[PDB]
Design a protein around this ligand. Structure first.
Ligand SMILES: Nc1ncnc2c1ncn2[C@@H]1O[C@H](COP(=O)(O)OP(=O)(O)NP(=O)(O)O)[C@@H](O)[C@H]1O
Length: 296
């Protein structure tokens, strides 16, 4: 038996290219792994099986619709083997919370099988499988913080002088990424929504470990479009700041709102205030960066 710990992610920066076709938007993102994690335990078995435990885990498929299952099938096929493993996932990355928990579990399956079967295929081969699986699996292997420029290309590692302290808050209902991109396209036709800074300043603030410098540079071009559809998000972001956060953004298409705090103490206090105030379904504290999928 091998257990791998793998983190969920938040996007600190997301610039979304103008629609082209067939209706694509080129994404430039700064990905940041944070300490809400799943732990995936893989053992040899007679047949592939998958079980998940933890809040929300009962909502998830336990067959080939689950990326972790597809990961086990791909890793085994890659080494000409049958995927004869049992997979147990202790899920603590909030479900449907926009932090790419199925992608983290898939990355963890790759790493757990690599270690369990004593194969030790190189990291390059794992990144290759992760790309086949889906667009967030590569970052779950990578972990830390990284800048991503587009579909294939390597992620670029960004090191920080100190850890950052987050409050992460999850709305009781997610939005379809489809709809948010539509409202983004429309807001741009009808007007001029926020267009982001360049990502170099964001990387410099991260490198410096300076949350006061990072805070006004967090951004997400999808946020306006989310907030257009669910205006409640606007009051939630304001509430988090009223609670003492430096800044808050929506991550991705939501439902994660991410609030950068000055310290672990501050995040505890901001988190308490936000939980008390009921603007969100779930409120959690976290630190980042943390490592990607690794055997524990
Ligand atoms: N172990 C898993 N494998 C694959 N899909 C999953 C898994 N868990 C949840 N999902 C699916 O993805 C949605 C729930 O999200 P989850 O994977 O919990 O983080 P997320 O909300 O997907 N973040 P993102 O990848 O950024 O969209 C639902 O439609 C689920 O069916």
């Amino acid at each position: 038996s091998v257990t791998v710990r793998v983190p969920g992610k938040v996007n600190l920066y997301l610039a979304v290219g103008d629609r082209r076709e067939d209706g694509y938007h080129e994404l430039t993102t700064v990905f940041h792994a944070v300490s809400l994690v799943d732990e995936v335990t893989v053992r040899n078995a007679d047949v592939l099986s998958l079980e998940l435990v933890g809040e929300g885990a009962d909502q998830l498929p336990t067959d080939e619709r689950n990326l972790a299952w597809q990961a086990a099938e791909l890793m085994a096929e890659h080494v000409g083997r049958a995927p004869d493993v049992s997979i147990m996932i202790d899920k603590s990355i909030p479900v449907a919370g926009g932090m790419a928990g199925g992608s983290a579990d898939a990355a963890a399956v790759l790493v757990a099988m690599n270690s369990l079967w004593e194969l030790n295929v190189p990291r390059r081969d794992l990144r290759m499988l992760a790309a086949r699986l889906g667009s967030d699996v590569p970052f779950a292997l990578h972990g830390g913080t990284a800048l991503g420029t587009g579909r294939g290309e390597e992620l670029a590692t960004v090191l920080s002088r100190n850890t950052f302290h987050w409050v992460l808050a999850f709305a009781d209902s997610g939005l379809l990424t489809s709809a948010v991109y539509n409202e983004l396209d429309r807001l741009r036709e009808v007007g001029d929504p926020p267009r982001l800074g360049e990502p170099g300043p964001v990387l410099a603030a991260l490198a410096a470990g300076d949350p006061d410098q990072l805070a006004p540079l967090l951004g997400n071009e999808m946020q306006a479009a989310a907030v257009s559809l669910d205006p409640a998000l606007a009051r939630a972001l304001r509430a988090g700041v009223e609670a003492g956060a430096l800044a808050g953004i929506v991550s991705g298409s939501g439902p994660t709102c991410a609030f950068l705090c000055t310290s672990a103490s501050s995040a505890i206090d901001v988190g308490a205030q936000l939980s008390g105030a009921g603007v969100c379904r779930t409120v959690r504290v976290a630190t980042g960066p943390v490592p990607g999928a690794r055997v524990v």
